[PDB]
Amino acid sequence: DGIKFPQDGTLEFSDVTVDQTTGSITLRAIFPNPDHTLLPGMFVRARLE
Amino acid sequence: QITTELPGRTSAYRIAEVRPQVSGIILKRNFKEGSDIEAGVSLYQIDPATYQATYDSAKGDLAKAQAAANIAQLTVNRYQKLLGTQYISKQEYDQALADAQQANAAVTAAKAAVETARINLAYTKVTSPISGRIGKSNVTEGALVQNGQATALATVQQLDPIYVDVTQSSNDFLRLKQELANGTLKQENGKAKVSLITSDGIKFPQDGTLEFSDVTVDQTTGSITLRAIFPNPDHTLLPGMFVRARLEEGLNPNAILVPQQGVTRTPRGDATVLVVGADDKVETRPIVASQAIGDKWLVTEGLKAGDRVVISGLQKVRPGVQVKAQEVT
Amino acid sequence: QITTELPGRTSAYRIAEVRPQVSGIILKRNFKEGSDIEAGVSLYQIDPATYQATYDSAKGDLAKAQAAANIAQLTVNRYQKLLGTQYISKQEYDQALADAQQANAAVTAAKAAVETARINLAYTKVTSPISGRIGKSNVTEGALVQNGQ
């Protein structure tokens, strides 16, 4: 919906290889979810620094 | 009360597919197709010859162990009778006691082997695990089967009650949860009530109830699944059909309903209403009315409680003109 | 400040797919879908008949081994008292001690076998490996489940 998620997470890089059919690298971040306001599988947009 | 219409599919309360626990060739079918089946009633008859031989071997081993235990017990009794007046050594009595205990343990092991042989032999008499109604037989007499194959011999399903699995988008679920948390929505009692619309559009005579809101999200579409349970006394619902569910999500005690005959919509989409001011003048005010309940538009913004607006004779009234306005029920 | 915006998908911290460790048929379901559950709580109930028979056989073998060990220990204890006054040769005492030790080792082996049988029997009570939210049941009562499907 475009609403900023109230809490903040941190970044733990995990995957260094490059996929063959996507040509992209996957970055892993961890977030606290106490309210259960995000479920496993949904689509999100992450802004890094 | 706000209701959401969602698509879904029905499913059986309890469905069991019959698979053979042993390997062999079928000889007979003991049930008639399309009939009600009680639990534990034998369905098929696989060839028991090999399992019969195994059972006989187990019985023979059990008999041998029993004979050994019998002779050990006889010797123990006689030695115990001797021991009263110290006519035999205590070591001999202890040895006899140990021999009897070992023979009894061997008898127990033989009994366990006989029990597992009996279980395997009775597995051939295929028994329906649950009650219900049995359908077509995917195999007939003379067809080979194997232990734990993927192809089911038959299916037994319970048609009362019935499950309805409907699909709800994740965004709607999240916004409803946020609205409930904020306080604009008031859930009541317990599980939400769900009504049904069949393929013909007929409202189901009974209203079901929802439970088990799922948490995983489908990747391909982006939606979660909801489950409701409908009692089915007359078997008017069969598993697998396509149904529409009207799902209630609480109460909104601030709804503003405006009759659709008193709002004007521009071709691009904007909507305006002719309010009547305190100066007996009419003023056009824009409003946001997206959802329509029956013939009443649900106003979300642009109107306040007690605002007094025209519903009839719109073509007879122009803005800025002093008009007598009369309340009409 | 330089920032990058990327698409992404969420995932659970710990996801466990409950799978059967033993073959058999399901008789009961001991949980309600869509509810938080603890660890070690039994979820299903597979048919234990064959595993119960195996457990009984193992216990019987253990009892036999224990009886043999008991009689060997009694003989050793009886010989020990006579050893003090030089009325039994040391060879016989050594042989009896060896027999007792062998019987004790056999008892240990039987205990290991019965422990394996107990573990296999307890596998039927399908236990949740972790604590968390559980969804629907892909199988119901009466289904047949194979080992490690």
Side-chain angles (χ1 to χ4, degrees):
Chain A
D1 50 4
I3 297 182
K4 182 137 282 167
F5 173 75
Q7 326 210 349
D8 254 359
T10 181
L11 158 77
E12 309 148 342
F13 199 90
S14 66
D15 194 62
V16 71
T17 173
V18 172
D19 194 294
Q20 308 266 51
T21 172
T22 295
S24 307
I25 320 177
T26 82
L27 280 55
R28 174 146 287 191
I30 188 155
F31 284 84
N33 179 31
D35 190 331
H36 294 55
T37 48
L38 57 153
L39 326 171
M42 42 161 30
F43 196 78
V44 287
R45 297 211 74 184
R47 272 161 39 78
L48 274 69
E49 320 286 337
Chain B
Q1 190 99 330
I2 41 182
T3 50
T4 303
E5 163 170 349
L6 309 155
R9 269 199 150 86
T10 63
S11 50
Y13 190 37
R14 284 196 210 141
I15 170 176
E17 65 280 16
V18 173
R19 321 236 295 282
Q21 295 252 34
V22 300
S23 320
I25 173 165
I26 291 182
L27 274 94
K28 217 168 70 75
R29 209 190 67 227
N30 279 323
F31 75 98
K32 61 149 315 166
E33 290 179 328
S35 73
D36 309 306
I37 288 295
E38 272 304 314
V41 152
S42 158
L43 301 195
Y44 289 78
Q45 172 69 65
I46 321 195
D47 217 10
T50 282
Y51 303 103
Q52 200 55 44
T54 304
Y55 187 65
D56 292 318
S57 175
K59 287 295 259 197
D61 272 296
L62 164 72
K64 170 174 181 178
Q66 278 191 347
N70 173 36
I71 180 55
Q73 192 51 56
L74 279 180
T75 304
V76 158
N77 271 347
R78 279 175 190 135
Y79 278 3
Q80 180 253 336
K81 221 175 302 311
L82 264 287
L83 192 60
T85 49
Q86 291 143 303
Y87 284 142
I88 60 158
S89 164
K90 207 171 303 151
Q91 189 73 14
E92 281 89 281
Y93 182 69
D94 289 353
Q95 196 86 65
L97 224 58
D99 295 354
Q101 290 177 351
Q102 295 184 107
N104 274 339
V107 162
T108 287
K111 271 174 188 170
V114 169
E115 209 47 53
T116 197
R118 175 203 74 84
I119 275 289
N120 263 310
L121 171 70
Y123 270 178
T124 77
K125 216 152 299 188
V126 189
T127 43
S128 94
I130 52 171
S131 288
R133 155 163 298 116
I134 191 154
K136 192 195 146 316
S137 168
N138 311 52
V139 303
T140 45
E141 314 162 356
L144 187 135
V145 312
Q146 296 256 116
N147 176 21
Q149 56 172 20
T151 310
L153 305 189
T155 313
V156 196
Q157 44 213 320
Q158 220 151 327
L159 297 188
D160 179 36
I162 218 165
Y163 282 126
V164 171
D165 306 308
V166 293
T167 286
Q168 161 143 276
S169 164
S170 49
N171 263 15
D172 315 339
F173 191 62
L174 258 286
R175 98 159 79 261
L176 272 278
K177 164 171 277 150
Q178 164 146 27
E179 282 176 1
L180 256 192
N182 161 276
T184 45
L185 291 203
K186 316 296 192 283
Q187 74 273 59
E188 211 274 314
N189 197 45
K191 329 282 183 84
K193 169 244 275 172
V194 169
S195 160
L196 201 37
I197 314 160
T198 323
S199 50
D200 183 46
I202 298 188
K203 319 263 151 193
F204 198 56
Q206 169 291 359
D207 39 17
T209 166
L210 169 163
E211 77 289 339
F212 162 42
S213 202
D214 207 320
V215 81
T216 181
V217 172
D218 196 352
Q219 308 283 359
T220 316
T221 279
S223 60
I224 74 183
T225 182
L226 275 308
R227 168 150 295 186
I229 171 174
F230 286 83
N232 189 16
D234 320 331
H235 297 340
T236 176
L237 292 179
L238 309 175
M241 38 200 314
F242 203 92
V243 289
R244 259 67 166 260
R246 162 157 283 99
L247 193 185
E248 316 169 328
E249 294 121 322
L251 209 38
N252 175 21
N254 305 77
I256 308 295
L257 295 189
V258 163
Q260 58 97 0
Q261 313 146 70
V263 68
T264 321
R265 269 208 146 84
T266 71
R268 257 66 204 162
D270 313 314
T272 48
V273 62
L274 271 169
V275 83
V276 164
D279 210 74
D280 226 19
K281 275 194 168 181
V282 316
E283 296 305 310
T284 88
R285 173 143 61 257
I287 63 184
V288 177
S290 70
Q291 184 151 39
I293 310 302
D295 71 319
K296 279 101 184 149
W297 288 109
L298 170 58
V299 174
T300 57
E301 205 185 2
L303 273 191
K304 250 45 186 192
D307 284 324
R308 180 219 167 113
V309 310
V310 197
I311 88 163
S312 80
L314 303 181
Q315 324 85 50
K316 310 317 168 283
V317 49
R318 318 270 78 78
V321 172
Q322 199 248 2
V323 183
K324 321 299 157 285
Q326 40 268 52
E327 185 46 78
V328 167
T329 40
Chain C
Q1 188 96 1
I2 299 187
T3 60
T4 61
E5 175 158 349
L6 316 152
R9 231 155 254 281
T10 56
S11 45
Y13 194 42
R14 265 190 283 275
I15 175 175
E17 311 259 9
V18 166
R19 310 236 295 280
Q21 300 252 40
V22 282
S23 325
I25 195 168
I26 301 181
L27 305 169
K28 203 105 157 60
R29 209 192 70 222
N30 290 341
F31 82 108
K32 42 159 310 173
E33 309 113 323
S35 61
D36 298 56
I37 73 175
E38 294 299 323
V41 153
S42 164
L43 298 186
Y44 299 97
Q45 170 56 59
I46 309 187
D47 215 15
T50 70
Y51 302 93
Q52 191 58 51
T54 305
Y55 192 62
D56 286 333
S57 171
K59 295 210 73 51
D61 290 346
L62 164 74
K64 171 165 186 164
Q66 258 189 338
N70 161 267
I71 178 52
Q73 188 65 52
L74 267 196
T75 289
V76 152
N77 264 357
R78 276 174 184 143
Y79 280 175
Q80 196 267 323
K81 274 154 205 167
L82 282 186
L83 183 72
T85 55
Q86 304 320 107
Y87 282 151
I88 177 174
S89 67
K90 288 189 200 342
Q91 190 68 23
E92 305 207 13
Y93 187 83
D94 294 357
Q95 168 61 232
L97 222 47
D99 275 358
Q101 293 175 349
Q102 296 195 128
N104 288 334
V107 156
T108 278
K111 268 179 182 172
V114 82
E115 171 75 14
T116 290
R118 181 194 63 83
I119 283 168
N120 247 27
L121 172 77
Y123 273 180
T124 74
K125 274 177 203 56
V126 180
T127 49
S128 99
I130 47 170
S131 318
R133 180 144 307 172
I134 180 159
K136 68 190 291 262
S137 178
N138 290 328
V139 299
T140 63
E141 318 182 357
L144 204 182
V145 288
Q146 300 283 110
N147 179 15
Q149 52 169 25

